[PDB]
């Protein structure tokens, strides 16, 4: 029912200068902290009004951690470049994601922790939170080092403990933002394509959270479905379209499922 | 809140 996630991106920039490191934190689909190694402040910064009430010990601590991660990912970039025999001239990317889900009762549901190299899976914590999956043989080296250091035990304690507890804290402190459910505003548009062909577009606007499903029903897996996109004010938008065969044989309908809707909506032209 | 541990490819 709710989730907290941290996303880390590290990029080597050999032709341009020092590496770049960006960290963002989300609760559900609401970002609440950021750190950009290219920015001037060099501190973790708030991005949601409910996190601003955290005291200076919180901001100092998160800044210390994220600054260490920035340095350490520079070493990782060099290590992985060695593992894969890659030259020093190319730009490469390391990404890390971790966090926890809680159910409707706000109790621990599952934890996550994964790394990617150049946008492909590298190593991931298994669902049981006790062992690792290495995507190729190079990542087995990293697996063996993390197993010898008992990383999974400390990580499991975080994912089932601190992660869940602070997620609950954020959910209460920002309940007016995080526990809301804005229902989709739905409408349909028709536009003529040819003399004997048209297109119907099923819209959905100003909804939160981003999870939504739009399906067309003549009574169809040959349609266009754009990615859910942010409006910019904390809600989301999405549409789907059908290429109807005739100018009037258009007895299709789209169904809109979203937790802000007690029953799935039905739209017709 | 972030996990309080460093972690890398060592």
């Amino acid at each position: 029912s709710h989730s907290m996630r941290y996303f880390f991106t590290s990029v080597s920039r050999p032709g341009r200068g020092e590496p770049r490191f960006i960290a963002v934190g989300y609760v559900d689909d609401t970002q609440f902290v950021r750190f950009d190694s290219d920015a001037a402040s060099q501190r973790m910064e708030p991005r949601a009004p409910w996190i601003e009430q955290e005291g200076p010990e919180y901001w100092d601590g998160e800044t210390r951690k994220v600054k260490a991660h920035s340095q350490t990912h520079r070493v990782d970039l060099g290590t992985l470049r060695g593992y894969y025999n890659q030259s020093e001239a190319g730009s490469h990317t390391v990404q890390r994601m971790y966090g926890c889900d809680v159910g409707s009762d706000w109790r621990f549901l599952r934890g996550y922790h994964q790394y990617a190299y150049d946008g492909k899976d590298y190593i991931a914590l298994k669902e049981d939170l006790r062992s690792w999956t290495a995507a190729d043989m190079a990542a087995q080296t990293t697996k063996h080092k993390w197993e010898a250091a008992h990383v999974a035990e400390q990580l499991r304690a975080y994912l089932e403990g601190t992660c869940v507890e602070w997620l609950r804290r954020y959910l209460e402190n920002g309940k007016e933002t995080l526990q809301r459910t804005d229902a989709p505003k739905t409408h349909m548009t028709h536009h003529a394509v040819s003399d004997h062909e048209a297109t119907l577009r099923c819209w959905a606007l100003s909804f939160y959270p981003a999870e939504i499903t739009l399906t067309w029903q003549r009574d169809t897996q040959d349609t266009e479905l754009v990615e859910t996109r942010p409006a910019g004010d904390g809600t989301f938008q999405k549409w789907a379209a059908v290429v109807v065969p005739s100018g009037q044989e258009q007895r299709y309908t789209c169904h809109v499922q979203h937790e802000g809707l007690p029953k799935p909506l039905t739209l017709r032209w | 809140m972030m996990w309080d541990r460093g972690l890398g490819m060592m």
Epitope: E57, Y58, K67, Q71, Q154, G161 | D4, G6
Partner: T-cell receptor, first 113, second 101 residues
Framework: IAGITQAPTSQILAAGRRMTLRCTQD?????MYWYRQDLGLGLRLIHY???????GKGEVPDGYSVSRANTDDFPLTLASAVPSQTSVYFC???????????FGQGTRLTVVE | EVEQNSGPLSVPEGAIASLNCTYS??????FFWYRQYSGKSPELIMF????GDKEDGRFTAQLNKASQYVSLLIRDSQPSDSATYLC???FGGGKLIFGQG
């Protein structure tokens, strides 16, 4: 016997003199720490280094500097010793920040006028 | 900070000794008990990072992050248990802070 060692074990220092306490470890620990211990105050953190190539200020950093160019060493420098820096100094390291710290032998330093 | 009673505490030889440590930072995620003999360096007794009890021979550590304390229990106190017991708490990013012992 991969461990952590400090040097020197004891030192007498005239006020105003420069002094560096050495601390090295071959455990490939990424985090290192410097503490001073005084009566009634326990251990107070002077400087820390959570990763090779960086340092940070502790509880009582004033009058002390450190550097961490390499994983192994973490030298503590007193640029101009003052009597209040008379103390026992302990270096420590952990595999990573957030994991258990292991301590060196300690350095008994006295600054005299 | 990190708060312990300075002592000195007496325990009869053979009896149970209990030590308590409180801390201020809600964000703290790892906790450590060290033993230090006079003129010597702190030696690690036990670490703990999950709520509950953790047993190691005659030693038991108890952590309650919701109540912001960590405790150490020593069973069948021996002469070699005479020492200063140091509580250490990680405040984030390498800021490892000790109580007064």
């Amino acid at each position: 016997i991969a461990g952590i060692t400090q040097a020197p074990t004891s030192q007498i220092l005239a006020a105003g003199r420069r002094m560096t306490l050495r601390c090295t470890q071959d455990m490939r620990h990424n985090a290192m720490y410097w503490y001073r211990q005084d009566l009634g105050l326990g251990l107070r953190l002077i400087h820390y280094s959570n990763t090779a190539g960086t340092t940070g200020k502790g509880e009582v950093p004033d009058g002390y500097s450190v550097s961490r160019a390499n994983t192994d060493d973490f030298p503590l420098t007193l640029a101009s010793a003052v009597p209040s820096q008379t103390s026992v100094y302990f270096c420590a390291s952990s595999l990573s920040f957030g994991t258990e710290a292991f301590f060196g032998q300690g350095t008994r330093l006295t600054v005299v006028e | 900070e990190v708060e312990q009673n300075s002592g000195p505490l007496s325990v009869p030889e053979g009896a149970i000794a209990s030590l308590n440590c409180t801390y201020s930072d809600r964000g703290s995620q790892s906790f450590f008990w060290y033993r230090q003999y006079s003129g010597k360096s702190p030696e690690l007794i036990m670490f703990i990072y999950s709520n509950g009890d953790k047993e190691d021979g005659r030693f038991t550590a108890q952590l309650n992050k919701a109540s912001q304390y960590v405790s150490l229990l020593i069973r069948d106190s021996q002469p070699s248990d005479s020492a200063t017991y140091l509580c250490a708490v990680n405040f984030g990013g390498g800021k490892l802070i000790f109580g007064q012992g």
